[PDB]
């Protein structure tokens, strides 16, 4: 179709809870990505984690995977800990930027 700017699937969960010691998965679905990129950023310190499937952080627990059938960019926090709880942002490199923010709770039980 006609060229579109990218937009988020606004039904993706924005409040996620996951277990200490297991992988946490944070999902972001971007339609019509085109030539932009999808990045994941950690709100508490503004640390860049991933851009596309490239991992910037050297905390090797972070990895972003692209699932092409659902246009999903899923941030995986392997071996998640309580200190990993908080807000993360999926960010499309438009100008101005477009963001989808997801809160993560990490619990033992």
């Amino acid at each position: 179709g006609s060229w579109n700017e990218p937009y988020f699937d606004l039904t993706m969960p924005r409040n996620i809870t996951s277990l200490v010691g297991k992988s946490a998965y944070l999902g972001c679905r971007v339609k019509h990505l085109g030539n932009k990129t999808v990045a994941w950023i950690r709100h508490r310190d503004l640390h860049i984690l991933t851009v596309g499937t490239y991992t910037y952080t050297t905390d090797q627990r972070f990895q972003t995977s692209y699932h092409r059938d659902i246009d999903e960019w899923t941030l995986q926090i392997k071996w998640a800990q309580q200190r990993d709880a908080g807000v993360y942002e999926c960010q499309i490199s438009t100008q101005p930027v477009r963001s989808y923010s997801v809160n993560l709770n990490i619990v033992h039980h």
């Binding site: 990045a39 310190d45 860049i48 851009v51 910037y56 050297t58 960010q91 490199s93």
Partner: protein, 104 residues
């Protein structure tokens, strides 16, 4: 631990509307680590290493050497005002912020 470290604070910048601005992140022992730039108030990623990420056409990067990493904002507007964070992918991450003042 021969880890990267900042050599001095990012200088702040005051620049008239329409002129060009440069932020410089001064580091030592960068090694294989990579300098990222982001805009602190919007959280927008500007660049990582030699790759501009933002599709803002006015944003470029350069390096003079391994110690000296620049973010360039051409023809600054009022919307460019605010903090620009230099970030290193050390573990834990290290960062500094410099601020752009746009004068009319």
């Amino acid at each position: 631990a021969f880890q990267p470290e900042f050599v001095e604070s990012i200088s702040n910048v005051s620049v008239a509307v329409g002129r060009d601005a440069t932020f410089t992140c001064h580091v030592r022992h960068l090694g294989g680590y990579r300098v990222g730039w982001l805009k602190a108030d919007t959280k927008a990623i500007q660049a990582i290493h030699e790759n501009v990420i933002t599709h803002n056409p006015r944003v470029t990067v350069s390096h003079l050497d391994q110690n000296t990493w620049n973010l360039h904002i051409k023809a600054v507007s009022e919307e460019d005002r605010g903090g620009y964070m230099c970030q290193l992918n050390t573990d834990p991450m290290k960062s500094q912020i410099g601020f752009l003042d746009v004068v009319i």
